[PDB]
Design a protein around this ligand. Sequence first.
Ligand SMILES: [Zn+2]
Ligand SMILES: [Zn+2]
Ligand SMILES: [Zn+2]
Ligand SMILES: [Zn+2]
Ligand SMILES: [Zn+2]
Ligand SMILES: [Zn+2]
Lengths: 445, 445
Amino acid sequence: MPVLENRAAQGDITAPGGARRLTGDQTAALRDSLSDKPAKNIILLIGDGMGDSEITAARNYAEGAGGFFKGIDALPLTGQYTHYALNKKTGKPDYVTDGAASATAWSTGVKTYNGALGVDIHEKDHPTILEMAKAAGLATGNVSTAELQDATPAALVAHVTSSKCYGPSATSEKCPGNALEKGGKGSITEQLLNARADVTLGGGAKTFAETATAGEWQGKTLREQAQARGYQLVSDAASLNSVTEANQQKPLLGLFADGNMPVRWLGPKATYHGNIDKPAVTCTPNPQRNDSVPTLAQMTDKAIELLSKNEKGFFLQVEGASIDKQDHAANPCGQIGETVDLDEAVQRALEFAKKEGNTLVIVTADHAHASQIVAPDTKAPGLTQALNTKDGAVMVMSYGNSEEDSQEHTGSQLRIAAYGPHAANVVGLTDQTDLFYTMKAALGL
Amino acid sequence: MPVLENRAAQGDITAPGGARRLTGDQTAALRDSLSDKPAKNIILLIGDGMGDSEITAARNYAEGAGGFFKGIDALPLTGQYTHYALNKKTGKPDYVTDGAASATAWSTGVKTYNGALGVDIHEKDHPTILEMAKAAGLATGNVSTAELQDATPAALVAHVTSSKCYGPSATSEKCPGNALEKGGKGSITEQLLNARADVTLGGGAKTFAETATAGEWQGKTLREQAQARGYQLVSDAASLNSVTEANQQKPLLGLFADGNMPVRWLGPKATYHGNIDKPAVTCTPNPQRNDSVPTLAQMTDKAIELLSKNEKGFFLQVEGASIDKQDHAANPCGQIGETVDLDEAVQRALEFAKKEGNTLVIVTADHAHASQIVAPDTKAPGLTQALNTKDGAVMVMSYGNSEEDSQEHTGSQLRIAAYGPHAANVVGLTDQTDLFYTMKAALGL
Ligand SMILES: [Zn+2]
Ligand SMILES: [Zn+2]
Ligand SMILES: [Zn+2]
Ligand SMILES: [Zn+2]
Ligand SMILES: [Zn+2]
Ligand SMILES: [Zn+2]
């Protein structure tokens, strides 16, 4: 069970065979990649919106066309999975999912309607993979660059009828069957605190300033409630670093931003005819992203350091969330940079799994998104931008699917990749619900 | 070695686990797909423009969201491959390839510039896989639904500086160094007639009416040259069925249309705000396609029959050409119908390979295209269309990347899948030029 140690172009891309990514026959190395033994641990990295177009754009920009991601591209067992949602009313396929339905699909193994967290079309709760791991005595972690109430982390720890039900105020008014004062389990935040994973790291500090409307902690802020229940609170990179354990007695909660955590790269918004009317853009670092905000990789390493102390095993989900968020924003530099943030975190996970030898690492996305790579001279009706790549060549990206100021998701099947025990369950055509069952079987749940 | 006999949804898509495509662990089934033994035959099926988006849109429409292509989705060993071209002047990546450069990349194993057939950026001729297979003593076939001078068939049999150089008339004017009356190898058609593949089936009849400017067949039509050299010429489905053998004495040449062969399904072109302003479309049969035109599946059937008499082995390429041609045209019914036509041919190929036991079948595209699956209510700046699927739900497709008649290719890496000996070399991230070297090492050339 190796990783792909290198799959860049092997020489001159203008000569015969110098664009090859393979040195020799792969049959031998693939046989050695196929193990059916238990997974002691699972690390699931999700790139929100990170379909094949978004993977290719970021490789082309940051590593060159012939380049190779030392995390993202290093996982040997690849396939394509479908992530279609359901219409709540009919029960038939909705071909473009949101993040709540898609994340619910892998977390719970049941399809659902757009905006649903941990509930089916019938609005009934199902147990998540995190919840099942915790019941089994495994350590758990939920890490995201987004608000911890974002669809992607919330799907592991909350069951609500709409994904907008962050805190009491919104839950009371949009998920009244889930609201705490109507006898429901609570808001996404209140449920997150009931879920009590060992490590929970991301943004979303703001909704912890809400007070509970009922229950044991009525009048307490949710920040105060977390502390009342014995959670360790950390707010920055130095405090995250200094935590020495995390468990059911001292569960860790890192709140690293008010909303979403700040993206690493800056560049202009793509504009109508923007590849024709602007100079090619080079991305810079984001000079508002303070140095004390931990990166996705730093959060991953600390999570692995704490979780790997449970001898029975652990389950860890890590989301590179603002890939999607910038793809909505039509901001190529932000998008590509957040794909780089995810590559770094994959490397940490893959490095871990090489050493430990019984960990299953899975890298995929929740759905496909808007950005396409198009020709230098393309006259498109949407938002475009020319970019200066590592190859010293112009790449143009287009966002062509909305007139309203959010570039929208797409329905294409997209890459899923895996390394370690049970990776075979990712090859060929699968559905996102199969991913729940893959993880279940590998952990012995 | 096993084929994926069924990977549809396994029950109620709304119930727990009823969207699953996997019935149990795949580790053992994937071990039994891995052989290092030599391939006696190869079938390379190319969907022109058939990216993951194109595949998903066609499955959604024709089989349903939880559906499954008995051909396209049945190949067990999957990955993603990169298909970037080069700028001719610089030798740097060009991120969106045409069909000529991409086909040249798998057919010769050297990257090239858009518009190039069988030549590098320096205009130097390189041998193709078809040419090599023949020289090694294996039978050869080249089947396409396009003109036999389209980039995809031409890159197996011609070495010209521009893909426009169809016959003498064009070659003298745009490829004056390859023109026959200047000491060149000839037009695309003239080089096809020289290459002398055992089976060649498609369209492009009209270029055979052009007459030659020099050489042995000066002053006779290219058609007459084909007759004088001992080709069996066939024009319809009845004539094709009547052929009993193909070989170097009697090579077969099927010319089934002036230009491209007619597409199977009809629909309206997508229009600005077409999902909002026009009714949901259901695809019908194409009235303009006589039953005398053989289908891609029928052409594949005959080619397999005639090539399989060579005990030493054969190489066959089959292109579903008009997936791309119609995706350019912003026509969901044309594109989807052609994707289904290709599925039928892939089925023929896998059925052959499962019984013969030493055949390597590969399905992929030359590049990705424009069509995106978007939300029912999308308000896009491009051309949209709502379609009534097999599920009984509306799917919308969007074409958002051009402002001219022709919608444009994209640069996203796309699915590549294989079955049979040496199919392991398709898994992970590969480049299009690796496909050349995979085939070459599979045949032992
Ligand atoms: Zn998402
Ligand atoms: Zn998310
Ligand atoms: Zn989104
Ligand atoms: Zn093409
Ligand atoms: Zn073609
Ligand atoms: Zn094309």
